[PDB]
């Protein structure tokens, strides 16, 4: 998952 600007 990427909950947030971490990969994204």
Request: hydrophobic share 0%.
């Amino acid at each position: 998952x990427c909950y947030x600007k971490t990969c994204t």
